[PDB]
Every structure is written in C-alpha cells, then in structure tokens.
Amino acid sequence: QETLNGGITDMLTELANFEKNVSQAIHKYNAYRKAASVIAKYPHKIKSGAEAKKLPGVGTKIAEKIDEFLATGKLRKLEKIRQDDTSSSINFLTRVSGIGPSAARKFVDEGIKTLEDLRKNEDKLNHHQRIGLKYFGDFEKRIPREEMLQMQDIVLNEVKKVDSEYIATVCGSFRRGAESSGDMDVLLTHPSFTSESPKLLHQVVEQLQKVHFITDTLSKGETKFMGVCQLPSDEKEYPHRRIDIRLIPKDQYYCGVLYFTGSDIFNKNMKAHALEKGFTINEYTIRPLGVTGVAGEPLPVDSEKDIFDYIQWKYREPKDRSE
DNA sequence: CCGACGGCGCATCAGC
DNA sequence: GCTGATGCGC
DNA sequence: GTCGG
Numbered sequence: 001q002e003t004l005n006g007g008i009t010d011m012l013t014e015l016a017n018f019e020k021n022v023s024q025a026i027h028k029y030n031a032y033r034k035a036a037s038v039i040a041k042y043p044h045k046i047k048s049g050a051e052a053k054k055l056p057g058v059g060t061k062i063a064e065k066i067d068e069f070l071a072t073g074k075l076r077k078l079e080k081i082r083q084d085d086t087s088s089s090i091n092f093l094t095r096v097s098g099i100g101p102s103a104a105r106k107f108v109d110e111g112i113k114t115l116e117d118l119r120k121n122e123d124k125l126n127h128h129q130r131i132g133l134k135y136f137g138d139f140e141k142r143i144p145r146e147e148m149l150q151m152q153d154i155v156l157n158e159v160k161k162v163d164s165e166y167i168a169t170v171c172g173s174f175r176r177g178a179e180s181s182g183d184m185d186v187l188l189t190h191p192s193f194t195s196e197s198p199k200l201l202h203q204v205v206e207q208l209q210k211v212h213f214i215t216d217t218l219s220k221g222e223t224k225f226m227g228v229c230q231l232p233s234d235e236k237e238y239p240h241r242r243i244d245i246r247l248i249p250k251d252q253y254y255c256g257v258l259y260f261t262g263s264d265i266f267n268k269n270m271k272a273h274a275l276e277k278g279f280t281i282n283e284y285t286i287r288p289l290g291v292t293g294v295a296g297e298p299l300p301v302d303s304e305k306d307i308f309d310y311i312q313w314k315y316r317e318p319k320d321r322s323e
Numbered sequence: 324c325c326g327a328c329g330g331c332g333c334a335t336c337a338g339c
Numbered sequence: 340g341c342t343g344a345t346g347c348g349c
Numbered sequence: 350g351t352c353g354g
C-alpha cells in the first residue's frame with residue numbers, strides 16, 4: 001500500500017539508484033533495495049527510525065535517514081544530488097539499455113547528458129546502446145499479461161515449426177501468473193542437446209526473425225540470445241519488447257526452468273530447504289551432499305516435480321512461488 | 324573488525 | 340591474432 | 350549499508 005510508507009521506499013530507491021549509477025557501489029545499491037523492499041512489505045505506517053531498524057536490512061544509517069524524512073519530509077543529501085547536474089545526468093543515461101555506470105560517466109564527462117545528445121552522437125554508441133536508445137520509451141513499458149499470451153502463442157508456434165521436438169517454456173513473472181511482465185524470457189531445450197553431448201538456438205532465432213517477430217538483436221551466441229520483438233499490428237502498433245532466449249542442456253532444463261521462474265525469495269527458501277535435507281541445488285543441478293559436505297554427482301531430473309520430490313517438498317505451483 | 328554481498332554469456336576492451 | 344579483463348544485463 | 354563470523 002504505497003501511501004503507507006511510499007515516501008520512505010521512494011527515498012531509499014532513489015538512494016539505491018545513485019549508489020549503483022553514480023558511486024558505482026553495487027553492494028550499497030543492493031542494501032538500499034533490500035531496505036526498500038522489506039519496508040514495502042511492512043503492514044504499518046512507520047513512525048520512527050527505531051521502528052524501522054527492527055526490520056532485517058534496515059540499519060543505523062537508514063534509521064537516521066528515516067528520522068530526517070519523517071521530521072522534515074525530505075533528505076538533504078538526496079535533495080542535493082537531485083539538483084546536481086552531473087549526478088542526475090549520469091543517473092539518467094543509465095536508463096538506456098547498454099549504458100551502464102561506466103559509459104554514463106564517460107558520456108557526461110564529455111558533455112553528453114541527454115537523449116538528444118545521444119541521438120546526436122551515434123558514432124559513440126555501440127550496437128546495444130543504439131538499440132537501447134531507439135526503443136528507450138518502449139523498453140520502460142510493462143507488458144500486459146494478455147500481450148504476453150499473444151507473444152507466447154507466436155514463440156511456441158514457431159519453435160514447434162522448426163522442430164517439433166524442441167521444448168520451450170516462458171519463465172519469469174509470467175509463469176508465476178503475474179498480470180504484467182517486464183520482458184519475455186524463453187528457456188529452450190532439445191533431446192539432442194545434453195551436458196555430455198551448435199545451431200539449435202540459431203534456427204529458432206532465425207525462424208522468429210523470418211516471421212518478423214524478432215526485430216533486433218542485442219547479443220547472440222550458442223546458448224543465449226537477447227533481443228527485441230514486436231507483436232503484429234489499422235490499430236496503433238504495439239511497443240517493442242525485450243525477449244531473451246536461453247538454450248539449456250536437456251538434463252539441466254528443469255533446474256533451469258525452476259530457477260528462472262523464481263522468485264528470488266522462493267529460490268532462496270527452496271535452496272535452504274534442500275540444504276537441511278542434504279542437497280545442494282543451483283541453476284543447473286541438484287546434487288547430494290556427503291557427511292563431510294562433498295557434493296556428489298548431479299541427480300537425474302526429468303521434471304520440476306523431480307526436484308521437489310528429492311527434497312521431500314510437495315510440488316509448488318508456479319503461481320504460489322512468491323515466497 | 325572486516326569480508327560477503329551471484330555469477331555467468333556475450334560484446335568489447337586491454338595487453339601482449 | 341590470442342587471451343584474459345571489464346562492462347553490462349540479466 | 351547491513352549483516353554476521
């Protein structure tokens with residue numbers, strides 16, 4: 001419920017962004033995000049820094065910041081950095097996909113501060129950055145679930161057309177049943193591809209380009225594609241969207257699907273459960289741990305269920321994996 | 324006090 | 340031209 | 350910045 005502590009969470013999120021994009025302190029970025037998130041879930045309107053400090057992730061300094069915010073309705077440090085031309089410009093440029101803190105700083109140092117300046121300096125942008133600039137606004141839009149379904153329709157159809165033995169699963173928030181998603185993440189496998197066994201990814205990307213669904217490529221190798229797609233349109237045309245496709249060995253596929261469905265909290269919790277049951281699970285495999293902590297060979301996994309069964313957990317519907 | 328905090332694929336850079 | 344590092348975004 | 354060994 002935004003209005004509850006929205007001022008605080010907004011404050012912490014802005015601080016997080018400056019740490020990541022300007023100070024290049026990724027661990028402070030994550031600290032602020034963690035604090036913002038735990039506070040976002042706190043079912044009460046916070047009345048003091050001390051009250052917030054009781055939450056894991058909120059420490060001495062953020063408590064102080066909350067006291068200042070509650071007393072004055074702002075934070076001096078944040079007001080200052082907001083009005084800082086160099087800082088605010090660096091922070092802004094990182095909103096372009098492909099421009100990170102390093103590129104943003106370099107651009108701003110040489111007087112390139114706005115999208116207009118970027119537009120004027122194509123020669124100084126790499127391929128990814130040019131695409132990020134081209135679809136700047138579209139990439140910041142969320143994707144309604146209904147469009148995700150139309151997108152899924154196309155992907156599953158074209159994948160099957162290339163080879164009916166491919167298996168493709170759209171993961172991320174969409175598989176968790178979310179009513180909107182930030183992008184589309186497709187996990188792909190094929191019986192012919194295992195850990196102990198190309199063009200499998202290429203043929204799928206190619207077919208999706210052939211029907212004009214994929215419009216641009218950000219990066220592409222033998223196992224990972226990142227690019228851009230658009231649903232077909234006298235109605236207004238759909239925004240361009242980010243799509244990733246990952247080719248994963250068949251024997252590691254379902255660990256992959258589990259992992260890339262998330263959420264992070266759920267993955268963390270399931271990893272914890274697995275441990276106390278004597279198993280180590282990561283993105284790729286689930287392995288038994290010996291009595292001295294030595295990891296055994298990967299266990300056979302032929303479905304998401306197999307994983308749950310190993311750790312004696314009842315199968316959890318993707319829709320029920322927020323925690 | 325002081326180290327961990329995720330780490331991997333791909334594009335591109337830096338050094339040789 | 341090769342190899343490892345870095346930047347970036349998942 | 351926060352946590353915890």
Ligand SMILES: Nc1ccn([C@H]2C[C@H](O)[C@@H](COP(=O)(O)C(F)(F)P(=O)(O)OP(=O)(O)O)O2)c(=O)n1
Pocket residue numbers: 172173174178180181182183259260261262263264267349
């Ligand atoms: N940087 C990352 C990100 C994700 N993942 C894996 C591990 C993650 O748990 C899993 C899902 O990512 P997610 O939960 O973050 C997300 F995308 F679905 P969400 O932002 O919540 O939703 P939405 O699309 O609406 O923005 O991918 C990862 O390994 N590394």
Ligand code: NA
Pocket residue numbers: 052053054055056057058059
């Ligand atoms: Na705390």
Ligand code: NA
Pocket residue numbers: 093094095096097098099100
């Ligand atoms: Na960026």
Ligand code: NA
Pocket residue numbers: 094095096097
């Ligand atoms: Na960004």
